[PDB]
Amino acid sequence: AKSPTDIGRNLARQWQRSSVRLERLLNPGSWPQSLNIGKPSARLFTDNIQAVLRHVENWRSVNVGKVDWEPVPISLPMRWHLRSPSEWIAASDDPRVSQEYAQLEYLVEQVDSAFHTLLVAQRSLWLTRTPEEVVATAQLATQLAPGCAQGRPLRLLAEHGVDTKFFERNATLLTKLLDERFEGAASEQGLTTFLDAFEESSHWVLVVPLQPGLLPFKRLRLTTSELAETPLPGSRLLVVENEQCVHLLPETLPDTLAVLGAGLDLHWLASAHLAGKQIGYWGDMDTWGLLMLARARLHQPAVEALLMEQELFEQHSQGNTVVEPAKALESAPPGLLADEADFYRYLLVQERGRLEQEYLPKAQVELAIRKWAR
Amino acid sequence: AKSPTDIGRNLARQWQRSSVRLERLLNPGSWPQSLNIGKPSARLFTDNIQAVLRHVENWRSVNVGKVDWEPVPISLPMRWHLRSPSEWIAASDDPRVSQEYAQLEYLVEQVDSAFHTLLVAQRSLWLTRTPEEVVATAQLATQLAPGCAQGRPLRLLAEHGVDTKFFERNATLLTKLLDERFEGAASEQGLTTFLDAFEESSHWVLVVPLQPGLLPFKRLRLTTSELAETPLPGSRLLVVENEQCVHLLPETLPDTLAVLGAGLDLHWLASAHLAGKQIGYWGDMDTWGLLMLARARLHQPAVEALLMEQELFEQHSQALESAPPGLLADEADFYRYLLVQERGRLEQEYLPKAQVELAIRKWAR
């Protein structure tokens, strides 16, 4: 013997489950749905006949759907028959449920069919975002392909919906939508890498003083653009290709700064401030690393290469070496020395040379840095 | 009239479709799957009887399942009855499909049923990772709750699977598994933010001085651990939640520093060097912003809120059940006012610069 209000409260609780929502929306075979009401207690009927009288009269005032009627001598309702979702929503009698259905119903008929399942079961994705943004984002996802940018800034990828702040408030939604179109590839690789688009904001690099008293802090992080025209303390500078090999650096070194994780943009070297000191480069031992060294030498004709020698490859060959996935170049890039060119040609012939910076003895790197600083 | 090899190639292509894989594995009633073979060409039969002869003894070497027979005078097979998945895989005749089923079957019977749908249709997630990692990560996902760390590092959050790089190679999988258990809450907030577990390092924040000569450089980025040990120059600080609002800040201010992008982590504020400094916290105007302001005020009792008055929200209009500790009376009332005032979210970025600079210079004395 449940009151009609009880069913509405119970129905609202059911709507909070993702399985219920998918069954109600994305399945026309869900309807019809019949709800049992229940017989009253015999003891209460004899003790308080008005209890069932108010109960039966309370069911006399329902008009959202149709209630099954049968005589028992007083006739009591025992089933509730709701046909349409409009009847179901109006049965819940909850504004939150009513408005959520309105938003979901609008999105279903606009957003593509492949995206219907995700949006229903992931209410948090669209709860904060306006319906216009979700529809526009879903349209953009359908017309994107892996590596579509192929080296273009993310601003220009948007056809018309570029604005100024659109992407950083829709990157999470765009990643999830692309995941179910490309079998979860966007989440694994990342939206930035998946589309092959580079963000030219700052390309932040790590700045580490190797001598206390050079900088107020101990682990800075600057930008390439700022470094292009900023004087740098210290009469020495060391460039490291990799990011997380900082522990391999000496714990101390006189008047020297280290710029780890420089990346490929070795264009800030050409400046008035940089000229005057000695610059050493210490990167990976591969075709790409030799290209970086050539670029650095082109920018500044004083780059003293460190730990890029053939004998290092010979002694540390039987460590952890892998095959380079793609040749950086089919010939020796210009700007390198004769020894560097010979080492490049040597590295070309071997099927497996990718001796990374990490897989090196700490003591040897220590002595190399000391002799460079000598 | 297709040769068994042709059907095997056709089945292999169908396996590449997410709907087919879900139908085969996650539906015991999917079986049986009967594949039509097809009648031969009458002209081809008359022109080259040996050609259709070759066809039938190509069907004499098939033993993957059972083939339906009907006599026609030469009898040709019309239907192929595949009962079990083992027959389906054996009919595919593809090494990649065979090993993919072995991994999928092994993972499904171990991993909870809540993630069965995701793994089947998102083959790229488990394709690269070892089976042990996926099983262990799924177990961790079923045993996690929002804000479980509640101010603890992620290293100790792991029950046993901490290792050294385990999360860095499994953060993406852990986020996706948590999302379907919590209705996509991990992806929106971020796994680090969702679990309330901020690492001491790698939490870089933006520091922009507002006066020449105070700092050697122009724009910096320091980890939150550094901010809790190194003394800071100047005499005033200005903390902002949103990082992408530096343009709204004024040009110059005497002896001020701006630590933008603080996030939820503000435990670095409790420091001897930061003590005795006039500081102000300018976060968003919502429940999360007020909670963050409360957390900031817990560490430092001299924090002066900026751009939080109810008048400012009311002129631009169109967490805990009760008020959290660390709110003044007006702010505590504002928290309850914003609690049920429609969609009470409004970012800093929608604030015109005319009043923002005026308020900041009002504070800057």
Automatic annotation (TrEMBL), chain B:
Naturally occurring in which organism (per UniProt): Pseudomonas aeruginosa (strain UCBPP-PA14)
Source superkingdom: Bacteria
InterPro entries in alphabetical order: DUF3322 (IPR024537), JetD_C (IPR024534), UCP028408 (IPR014544)
A Pfam family recorded for this sequence: DUF3322
Every Wadjet protein JetD C-terminal domain range: 198-356
Coiled coil location: none
Protein name: DUF3322 and DUF2220 domain-containing protein
Ranges where the DUF3322 domain occurs: 4-179
Species classification: Bacteria, Pseudomonadati, Pseudomonadota, Gammaproteobacteria, Pseudomonadales
